[PDB]
Amino acid sequence: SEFNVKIYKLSAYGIKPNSGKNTTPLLTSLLKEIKSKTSDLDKVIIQFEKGRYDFYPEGAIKREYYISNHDQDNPKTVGIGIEKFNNITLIGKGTDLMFHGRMLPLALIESSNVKIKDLNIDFEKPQITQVKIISNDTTAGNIVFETAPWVKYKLKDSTFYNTGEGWEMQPTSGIAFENGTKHIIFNSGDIGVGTKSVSEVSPGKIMAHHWKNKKLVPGTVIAMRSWQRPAPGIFVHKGKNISFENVKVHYAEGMGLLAQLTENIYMDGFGVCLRGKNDPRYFTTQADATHFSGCKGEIVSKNGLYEGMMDDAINIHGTYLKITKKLDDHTVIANYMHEQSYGFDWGNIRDTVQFIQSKTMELWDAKNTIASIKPILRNSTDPIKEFRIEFTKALDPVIDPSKQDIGIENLSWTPSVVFTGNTIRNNRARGALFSTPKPTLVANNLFDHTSGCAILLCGDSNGWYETGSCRDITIRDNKFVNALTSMYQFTSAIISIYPEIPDLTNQKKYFHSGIRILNNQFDTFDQPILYAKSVDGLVFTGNKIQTNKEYPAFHSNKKRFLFERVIGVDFSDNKVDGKPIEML
Ligand SMILES: OC[C@H]1O[C@H](O)[C@H](O)[C@@H](O)[C@H]1O
């Protein structure tokens, strides 16, 4: 073409801000055309203006997607489908993409060199229900709660439903928040909610007749929810060189950003957050803010704001298949085991694999290489639950599924990580999960009142089936303020290194190695700073621990440092309230 970049200002093509019309069928039809014309090396930009674009289900594409760490409800109702479309940039100018009903806002499928920039994603009617405690009669167990202004509910058979366009969902749990600070209420975590046995006092004032909780003082704001997570805000599958710059996801029925089987991801200014100090909402995403399942290359996530999520800010991990059958010396059948991670590819020819003894979480040193890999399917349409993997090298007969439980990590689909200069706060569960053997830098982050623990290095081939023996990770120059006001799975200390190990007494081999924790600041009211299970090599140096009394100490673990099957400890130049603490 006669142009280096072909720029499509959307308003020039019949797609205007603040029209209040359904943008879905228009942008869909338009992209389809721009695609059919642009050859491959051709570069494209799609440009939104200031103001608001609404997207509804009607006229949306219906894609069958399998999404890591999410409910496998199909089809998905997809707002914007970037599919097999390269060198494309979606850009806005303080733009507000507003979605309605149950939708997957943005899907990036099998696309390279995609950039998303200066653009916000939100739903008008979040499936999460915000309410405010009006009166709590602790004796009778009567709570009156006020629905927030934007909430449309129905009562049917004394049951509280939350509604939006084409959906109706009864909340079963919640997260309580301090009024004002927007912290999560001390020792709350997941709590039951009084959505059964209800009746209407007056519009937007609901009486719960059998709700007993002394913690829900007048003023407390509660995010009532279910466990459903069918679609993330931005889904990315099989991307190469993907970019997000100044992109905020304010809410989605699932994770903010879920990227899988993607090589190289760059994020500057990514937020999953509120619209500022004046946002009436206390909550953001129904699940994790950002999530990276089975990625590779380099992941940069910097200068982000994550707040009020119903889960972690970042989670970086792979998937252990479980071997169900050994056909011969070279060939096994292996299966996806969790309900929320199946239906997508796991590896390719030439991938490096290693095997794990699930019961004691011990690696075999003998690595292998995939020679062949084919999903096993009765009908073509069926989803990928089960593979037949062939290795180049023969397997030592000790690797037989009828002898013990054996898992497979794909060491090729593992990304390197830079997670710097972010702010995480006021969110459910942990702050950040890292599970990658590749080099990882976690630096100059602020963990301001995470509900659970700040950082979690896990690994589990029994429950979650999420890989991550760590080998190389520096957690430096971070600030951790009053982490762990509430318990969740694995929250044993501000930094918890907690692999899921069924049989620890019999473990000979250390699961994690090469962990350096240098020059951090821990502002805490409690005791537990570091918990470490099954580590060979653990540096803890130059760290400052400052005590405060913003809350009562309470954690069962009353030890600053708690090690279990840990060798290789280097511990120097640490302080507590400006006084040294040495091992010797
Ligand atoms: O501990 C693993 C767990 O971490 C978070 O809670 C995610 O929401 C889950 O999908 C899973 O990744």
Author numbering: 34 to 617
Provide passages from the article that reported this PDB entry.
The B antigen that is present on red blood cells (RBCs) of type B only differs from the H antigen that defines type O by the terminal galactose unit connected by an α‐1,3‐glycosidic bond to the sub‐terminal galactose. Thus, removal of this additional galactose yields the H antigen of blood type O. For this, we characterized several previously unstudied α‐1,3‐galactosidases belonging to the GH110 family. Our findings revealed that the α‐1,3‐galactosidase from Pedobacter panaciterrae (PpaGal) exhibits superior efficiency compared to previously described galactosidases. Analysis of the structures revealed that the core β‐helix of PpaGal is surrounded by two small β‐barrel domains (domains I and II) as it is typical for enzymes of the GH110 family.
The structure of PpaGal in complex with galactose was refined to 2.98 Å resolution, while a resolution of 2.75 Å was obtained for the structure of the non‐complexed apo‐form of PpaGal. The galactose is bound in the active site by an extended hydrogen bond network established with several amino acids. Additionally, a stacking geometry via CH‐π‐interaction between the galactose and the tryptophan W497 was found, which often occurs in CAZymes. Interestingly the position of this tryptophan residue shifts if no galactose is bound. Therefore, this specific tryptophan residue which is also highly conserved, seems to have a “gating function” for the substrate. Overall, the observed crystal structures share a similar fold and similar active site residues compared to other recently solved crystal structures of the GH110 family, i. e., the galactosidase from Pseudoalteromonas distincta U2 A (PdGH110B) and from Akkermansia muciniphila (AmGH110A). Thus, a similar inverting catalytic mechanism of the GH110 enzyme class can be assumed where the three aspartic acid residues function as the catalytic residues. Interestingly, at the same position of the recently discovered α‐galactosidase of Akkermansia muciniphila that was found in the human gut, also a tyrosine residue is present at the position where we inserted the substitution W260Y in PpaGal that led to increased activity, even though this residue is not directly located in the active site.
